[PDB]
Write an enzyme that holds these catalytic residues in place. Structure first.
Site, mmCIF file in Angstrom:
data_model
loop_
_atom_site.group_PDB
_atom_site.id
_atom_site.type_symbol
_atom_site.label_atom_id
_atom_site.label_comp_id
_atom_site.label_asym_id
_atom_site.label_seq_id
_atom_site.Cartn_x
_atom_site.Cartn_y
_atom_site.Cartn_z
ATOM 1 N N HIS A 65 -3.457 11.643 -0.111
ATOM 2 C CA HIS A 65 -2.821 11.177 1.162
ATOM 3 C C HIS A 65 -1.669 12.051 1.462
ATOM 4 O O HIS A 65 -0.831 12.395 0.624
ATOM 5 C CB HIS A 65 -2.399 9.736 0.940
ATOM 6 C CG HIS A 65 -1.630 9.154 2.125
ATOM 7 N ND1 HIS A 65 -2.094 9.179 3.436
ATOM 8 C CD2 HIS A 65 -0.426 8.521 2.130
ATOM 9 C CE1 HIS A 65 -1.147 8.540 4.186
ATOM 10 N NE2 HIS A 65 -0.145 8.125 3.446
ATOM 11 N N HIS A 67 1.469 11.814 3.238
ATOM 12 C CA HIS A 67 2.263 10.613 3.621
ATOM 13 C C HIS A 67 3.155 10.875 4.797
ATOM 14 O O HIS A 67 4.006 11.729 4.781
ATOM 15 C CB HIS A 67 3.112 10.238 2.430
ATOM 16 C CG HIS A 67 3.990 9.030 2.688
ATOM 17 N ND1 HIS A 67 3.830 7.858 1.974
ATOM 18 C CD2 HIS A 67 5.018 8.851 3.592
ATOM 19 C CE1 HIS A 67 4.720 6.984 2.506
ATOM 20 N NE2 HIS A 67 5.439 7.560 3.424
ATOM 21 N N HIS A 110 0.320 12.711 -2.185
ATOM 22 C CA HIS A 110 0.080 12.055 -3.444
ATOM 23 C C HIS A 110 -1.297 11.544 -3.548
ATOM 24 O O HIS A 110 -1.987 11.263 -2.569
ATOM 25 C CB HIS A 110 1.077 10.883 -3.670
ATOM 26 C CG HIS A 110 1.071 9.808 -2.598
ATOM 27 N ND1 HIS A 110 0.236 8.764 -2.576
ATOM 28 C CD2 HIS A 110 1.930 9.602 -1.520
ATOM 29 C CE1 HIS A 110 0.589 7.954 -1.524
ATOM 30 N NE2 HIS A 110 1.649 8.425 -0.841
ATOM 31 N N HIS A 112 -4.080 8.938 -3.798
ATOM 32 C CA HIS A 112 -4.200 7.570 -3.250
ATOM 33 C C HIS A 112 -5.451 6.900 -3.750
ATOM 34 O O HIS A 112 -6.136 6.181 -3.016
ATOM 35 C CB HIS A 112 -4.116 7.643 -1.688
ATOM 36 C CG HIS A 112 -3.469 6.418 -1.054
ATOM 37 N ND1 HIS A 112 -3.840 5.149 -1.380
ATOM 38 C CD2 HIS A 112 -2.509 6.296 -0.085
ATOM 39 C CE1 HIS A 112 -3.076 4.305 -0.645
ATOM 40 N NE2 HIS A 112 -2.213 4.987 0.159
ATOM 41 N N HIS A 397 10.538 -4.876 -1.833
ATOM 42 C CA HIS A 397 9.263 -4.184 -1.621
ATOM 43 C C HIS A 397 9.380 -3.205 -0.458
ATOM 44 O O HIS A 397 9.703 -3.621 0.656
ATOM 45 C CB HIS A 397 8.164 -5.170 -1.325
ATOM 46 C CG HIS A 397 7.918 -6.193 -2.363
ATOM 47 N ND1 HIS A 397 7.275 -5.890 -3.556
ATOM 48 C CD2 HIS A 397 8.343 -7.499 -2.430
ATOM 49 C CE1 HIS A 397 7.255 -7.005 -4.267
ATOM 50 N NE2 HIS A 397 7.868 -7.983 -3.612
ATOM 51 N N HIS A 400 4.880 0.271 3.761
ATOM 52 C CA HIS A 400 4.517 1.516 4.423
ATOM 53 C C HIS A 400 3.276 1.330 5.280
ATOM 54 O O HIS A 400 2.329 0.676 4.838
ATOM 55 C CB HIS A 400 4.252 2.609 3.337
ATOM 56 C CG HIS A 400 3.673 3.846 3.884
ATOM 57 N ND1 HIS A 400 4.232 4.603 4.872
ATOM 58 C CD2 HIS A 400 2.497 4.504 3.555
ATOM 59 C CE1 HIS A 400 3.470 5.649 5.139
ATOM 60 N NE2 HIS A 400 2.401 5.632 4.336
ATOM 61 N N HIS A 402 0.336 3.511 7.360
ATOM 62 C CA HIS A 402 -0.252 4.807 7.671
ATOM 63 C C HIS A 402 -0.476 4.980 9.180
ATOM 64 O O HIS A 402 -0.534 3.997 9.905
ATOM 65 C CB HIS A 402 -1.652 4.880 6.998
ATOM 66 C CG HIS A 402 -1.633 4.941 5.513
ATOM 67 N ND1 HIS A 402 -2.548 5.779 4.887
ATOM 68 C CD2 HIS A 402 -0.913 4.344 4.544
ATOM 69 C CE1 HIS A 402 -2.349 5.631 3.594
ATOM 70 N NE2 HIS A 402 -1.404 4.780 3.319
ATOM 71 N N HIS A 452 0.894 -1.383 3.241
ATOM 72 C CA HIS A 452 0.967 -1.859 1.868
ATOM 73 C C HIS A 452 2.358 -1.608 1.316
ATOM 74 O O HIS A 452 3.079 -0.777 1.792
ATOM 75 C CB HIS A 452 -0.091 -1.171 0.952
ATOM 76 C CG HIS A 452 0.078 0.298 0.848
ATOM 77 N ND1 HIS A 452 0.879 0.921 -0.106
ATOM 78 C CD2 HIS A 452 -0.527 1.281 1.539
ATOM 79 C CE1 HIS A 452 0.728 2.232 0.033
ATOM 80 N NE2 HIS A 452 -0.085 2.494 1.014
ATOM 81 N N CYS A 453 2.666 -2.349 0.264
ATOM 82 C CA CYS A 453 3.851 -2.053 -0.547
ATOM 83 C C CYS A 453 3.626 -0.723 -1.241
ATOM 84 O O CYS A 453 2.539 -0.503 -1.809
ATOM 85 C CB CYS A 453 4.073 -3.125 -1.557
ATOM 86 S SG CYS A 453 5.607 -2.739 -2.523
ATOM 87 N N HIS A 454 4.598 0.137 -1.187
ATOM 88 C CA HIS A 454 4.505 1.475 -1.834
ATOM 89 C C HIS A 454 4.960 1.477 -3.250
ATOM 90 O O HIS A 454 5.013 2.587 -3.870
ATOM 91 C CB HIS A 454 5.202 2.515 -0.975
ATOM 92 C CG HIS A 454 4.467 3.841 -0.972
ATOM 93 N ND1 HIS A 454 4.265 4.587 -2.152
ATOM 94 C CD2 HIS A 454 3.909 4.571 -0.006
ATOM 95 C CE1 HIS A 454 3.604 5.702 -1.807
ATOM 96 N NE2 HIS A 454 3.359 5.737 -0.533
ATOM 97 N N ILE A 455 5.245 0.353 -3.882
ATOM 98 C CA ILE A 455 5.319 0.307 -5.352
ATOM 99 C C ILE A 455 3.882 0.291 -5.813
ATOM 100 O O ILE A 455 3.109 -0.632 -5.517
ATOM 101 C CB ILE A 455 6.095 -0.956 -5.789
ATOM 102 C CG1 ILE A 455 7.563 -0.843 -5.360
ATOM 103 C CG2 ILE A 455 5.928 -1.134 -7.282
ATOM 104 C CD1 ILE A 455 8.390 -2.114 -5.514
ATOM 105 N N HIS A 458 2.130 -2.553 -7.369
ATOM 106 C CA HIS A 458 1.886 -3.743 -6.484
ATOM 107 C C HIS A 458 0.710 -3.529 -5.604
ATOM 108 O O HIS A 458 -0.071 -4.445 -5.364
ATOM 109 C CB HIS A 458 3.179 -4.019 -5.655
ATOM 110 C CG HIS A 458 4.327 -4.360 -6.482
ATOM 111 N ND1 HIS A 458 5.565 -4.579 -5.899
ATOM 112 C CD2 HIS A 458 4.489 -4.522 -7.836
ATOM 113 C CE1 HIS A 458 6.425 -4.862 -6.869
ATOM 114 N NE2 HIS A 458 5.802 -4.861 -8.041
ATOM 115 N N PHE A 463 -1.371 -5.823 -2.963
ATOM 116 C CA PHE A 463 -0.343 -6.047 -1.875
ATOM 117 C C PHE A 463 -0.569 -5.111 -0.693
ATOM 118 O O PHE A 463 0.209 -4.198 -0.430
ATOM 119 C CB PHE A 463 1.045 -5.900 -2.481
ATOM 120 C CG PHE A 463 2.132 -6.773 -1.865
ATOM 121 C CD1 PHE A 463 1.872 -7.892 -1.061
ATOM 122 C CD2 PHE A 463 3.465 -6.552 -2.187
ATOM 123 C CE1 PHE A 463 2.868 -8.737 -0.671
ATOM 124 C CE2 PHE A 463 4.480 -7.364 -1.761
ATOM 125 C CZ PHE A 463 4.203 -8.481 -1.016
HETATM 126 CU CU LIG Z 1 6.049 -4.351 -3.949
HETATM 127 CU CU LIG Z 2 2.757 7.530 0.392
HETATM 128 CU CU LIG Z 3 1.119 6.948 4.028
HETATM 129 CU CU LIG Z 4 -1.007 4.184 1.477
HETATM 130 F F LIG Z 5 1.108 7.923 6.400
#
Ligand SMILES: [Cu+2]
Ligand SMILES: [Cu+2]
Ligand SMILES: [Cu+2]
Ligand SMILES: [Cu+2]
Ligand SMILES: [F-]
Ligand SMILES: *[C@@H]1O[C@H](CO)[C@@H](O[C@@H]2O[C@H](CO)[C@@H](O)[C@H](O)[C@H]2NC(C)=O)[C@H](O)[C@H]1NC(C)=O
Ligand SMILES: *[C@@H]1O[C@H](CO)[C@@H](O[C@@H]2O[C@H](CO)[C@@H](O)[C@H](O)[C@H]2NC(C)=O)[C@H](O)[C@H]1NC(C)=O
Length: 497
Positions: A65, A67, A110, A112, A397, A400, A402, A452-455, A458, A463
């Site tokens: 991905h 980001h 990163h 994904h 949290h 994020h 996309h 989604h949460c980016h942790i 999670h 999540f």
């Molecule tokens: Cu989270």
């Molecule tokens: Cu990302």
């Molecule tokens: Cu993204």
């Molecule tokens: Cu994502």
């Molecule tokens: F994105």
């Protein structure tokens, strides 16, 4: 050493020892972090990803991905496994061929697939602006002004035991740092500056989990960009940066020639700076090669507060100036129980057929899309509001979205919305118990976009939801190359699905 916009990117396994402890990793370009991918605004990026992974302990499939990049008309290139593609299998390659119209700033890339980016596949992605409105504020902006913050684990991501707490073992600043336990005096990163010059520092959190309190002894930082969005100048002495966020700041090398500590304090893991953990070095040209002797204040004078940020351009806020003042106002119920997260009562489990493929095969409402309950349709050309009230365990949290950036109408720790001039960004902390962080955007980009949460831990525990924006126009808007069409049959054959 920047690569792109047209480049090969090999994904391999290797041993690395960024805090003096050796472990195998999943690497782009043979390094941690990966090489910086760069180009100019509007460029055509052609990133041919070669999957050469062979160690199944970190997964031999991959998907990457980019980001923050909107991928308008190229949803197939966005990267989230089982949302926009099937993974690339080992021994194969895939050309992520896309354009970056209308965007310029600091991004990252990163894996994904699963929690694989935690194993090492993460790196910076910079889109320069030849006519940058902030150009006159600094003298130097290059690979040497990128600062990455990363968490690093001694245990492999796939091998984190079920029902044990996950914390990192080191903070890495530009790929180096020292371990929280059994600390050894492994080398620290050095950022070099020349007295009198001004630098555009590009601060990138490539974290899988913690947020960091980032500061530089003796120095202050003038924020000029937030997640790709140019900002009004805001001078701060500390920045709390959450997973996946980016800031550019001007650093004025206006202190005496010397050595100064760079500090990045995670919210979990090792606390403080004993033995040089959580640290890097800012060294002026001409300084002695030795560790800094500076100290942090007890209390920072001007920490970043998100409501103090405003766009450089007149971006406004879409919709009407009150809660629910949108064409499609949503309030998500975000919860955690028994090891799983959920959104509106549904825990995300990736589907067998990627969401985009299900749409291109003819599924034309969100109730027909798998996973059931995890795909929400959005209408075209509409103002969307999403409230993300906090409370779920494991916070704060960083959510994020996309395909989009968004106005942050309400931020953490402040109950007052801003319908006039809030910052726009792509990853936002939803804050703490009782908060009601809220985002707005308009739907002008057909395709399935992950939220989604980016942790990453999670995300893996569910999540997430997918916004299927403008289902009816998705196929016409996003023509797919034959190589993309080939991914799912190849993956399913290799995995006996
Ligand atoms: Cu989270
Ligand atoms: Cu990302
Ligand atoms: Cu993204
Ligand atoms: Cu994502
Ligand atoms: F994105
Ligand atoms: C967060 O803000 C949203 C609106 O953006 C609130 O949503 C309302 O919730 C109540 C029930 O709690 C409903 O009767 C309304 O229909 C919802 N929409 C409105 C007023 O626009 C939500 O309650 C807020 N959550 C928190 C925790 O403050
Ligand atoms: C809480 O958030 C609000 C809304 O973003 C902030 O209020 C703004 O404050 C600025 C600076 O004083 C004023 O110019 C604006 O007119 C305010 N907007 C609104 C809608 O009230 C407020 O400053 C934040 N609180 C703290 C403590 O930072």
């Amino acid at each position: 050493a920047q690569i792109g916009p047209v480049t090969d990117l090999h994904i391999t396994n290797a041993n690395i020892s960024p805090d003096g402890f050796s472990r195998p990793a999943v690497l782009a370009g043979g390094t941690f972090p990966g090489p910086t991918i760069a180009g100019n605004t509007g460029d055509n990026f052609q990133i041919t990803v070669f999957n050469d992974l062979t160690d199944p302990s970190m997964l031999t499939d991959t998907s990457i991905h980019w980001h923050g990049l909107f991928q308008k008309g190229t949803n197939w290139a966005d990267g989230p496994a089982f949302v926009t593609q099937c993974p690339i299998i080992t021994g194969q390659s895939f050309d992520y061929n896309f354009n970056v119209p209308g965007q310029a700033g600091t991004f990252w890339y990163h894996s994904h697939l699963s929690t694989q980016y935690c194993d090492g596949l993460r790196g910076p992605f910079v889109v320069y602006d030849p006519n940058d409105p902030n150009a006159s504020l600094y003298d130097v902006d290059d690979d040497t002004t990128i600062i990455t913050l990363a968490d690093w684990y001694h245990t492999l991501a796939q091998q984190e035991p079920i029902g044990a707490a996950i914390t990192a073992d080191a903070t890495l600043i530009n790929g180096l740092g020292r371990s929280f336990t059994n600390t050894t005096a492994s080398p620290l990163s050095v950022i070099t500056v020349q007295s009198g010059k001004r630098y555009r520092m590009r601060l990138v959190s490539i974290s899988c989990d913690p947020n960091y309190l980032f500061s530089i002894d003796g120095h202050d930082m003038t924020i000029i960009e937030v997640d790709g969005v140019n900002s009004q100048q805001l001078t701060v002495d500390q920045i709390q940066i959450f997973a996946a966020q980016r800031y550019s700041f001007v650093l004025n090398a206006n202190q005496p020639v010397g050595n100064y500590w760079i500090r990045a304090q995670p919210n979990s893991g090792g606390q403080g700076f004993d033995g040089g953990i959580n640290s890097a070095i800012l060294r002026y040209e001409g300084a002695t090669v030795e560790d800094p002797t500076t100290t942090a204040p007890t209390t920072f004078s001007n920490p970043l507060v998100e409501t103090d940020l405003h766009p450089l351009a007149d971006l406004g806020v879409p919709g009407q100036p009150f809660r629910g003042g949108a064409d499609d106002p949503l309030v998500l119920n975000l919860a955690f129980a028994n090891g799983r997260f959920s959104i509106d009562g549904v825990s995300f489990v990736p589907p067998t057929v990627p969401v985009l493929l299900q749409i291109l095969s003819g599924a034309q409402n969100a109730q027909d899309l798998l996973p059931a309950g995890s795909v929400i349709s959005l209408p075209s050309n509409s103002v969307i509001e999403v409230a993300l009230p906090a409370g779920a365990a494991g916070g704060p949290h960083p959510f994020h979205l996309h395909g989009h950036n968004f106005a942050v109408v309400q931020s953490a720790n402040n109950a007052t919305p801003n319908y006039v001039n809030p910052i726009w960004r792509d990853t936002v902390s939803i804050g703490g118990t009782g908060d009601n962080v809220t985002i707005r955007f308009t739907t002008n980009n057909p395709g399935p976009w992950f939220l989604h949460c980016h942790i990453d831990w999670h995300l893996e525990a569910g999540f997430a939801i997918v916004f299927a924006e403008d289902i009816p126009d998705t196929a016409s808007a996003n023509p797919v190359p034959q190589a993309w069409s080939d991914l799912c049959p190849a993956y399913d054959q290799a995995h006996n699905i």
